[PDB]
Design an enzyme around this catalytic site. Sequence first.
Site, PDB file in Angstrom:
ATOM      1  N   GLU A  11      12.704   3.945 -10.444  1.00  0.00           N
ATOM      2  CA  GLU A  11      14.049   3.963 -10.245  1.00  0.00           C
ATOM      3  C   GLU A  11      14.400   4.046  -8.998  1.00  0.00           C
ATOM      4  OE1 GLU A  11      15.119   4.844 -12.690  1.00  0.00           O
ATOM      5  OE2 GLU A  11      13.681   5.048 -14.717  1.00  0.00           O
ATOM      6  N   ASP A  20      23.957   4.705 -14.471  1.00  0.00           N
ATOM      7  CA  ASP A  20      23.033   4.150 -14.835  1.00  0.00           C
ATOM      8  C   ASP A  20      22.903   2.398 -14.561  1.00  0.00           C
ATOM      9  OD1 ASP A  20      22.641   3.879 -17.350  1.00  0.00           O
ATOM     10  OD2 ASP A  20      20.698   5.194 -17.262  1.00  0.00           O
TER      11      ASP A  20
END
Length: 162
Positions: A11, A20
């Site tokens: 991540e 994202d």
Amino acid sequence: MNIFEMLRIDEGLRLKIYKDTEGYYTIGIGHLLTKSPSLNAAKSELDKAIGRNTNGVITKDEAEKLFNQDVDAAVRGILRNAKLKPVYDSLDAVRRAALINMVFQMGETGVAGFTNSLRMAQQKRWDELAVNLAKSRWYNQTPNRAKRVITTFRTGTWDAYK
Ligand SMILES: [Cl-]
Ligand SMILES: [Cl-]
């Protein structure tokens, strides 16, 4: 290697609100804020999550606190899910990390839906699981990460991360 280090690699760490890969407002270590197209809504959620007027920016320390809560919730979500719990219980420590990673990324409900793969995982049919996991949007949208999780699941080792 552990779940924390594993997810931190997958991540990354970002201190400013960002979108994202799906285009959702996120922050820290993969902490989804909202699916809404509004930055204000994101900032709102952010402030409510942190407990202060952040203005879309947080500290490392704040990012890590969100991260601790999120890993914890992922585990608990697993243990509370009728479909997931038994899979989890049947796995070795490394493979549990693989399942946790998927859950953190796609939500309990999402993973709980991979009916066939959950069965293969339970029957410990590793190669077949790997093939099956690859036939998914997840793999097609984020192939490198997906390959990492799949190898971990398949092999029971941390090689893809080393
Ligand atoms: Cl939260
Ligand atoms: Cl990727």
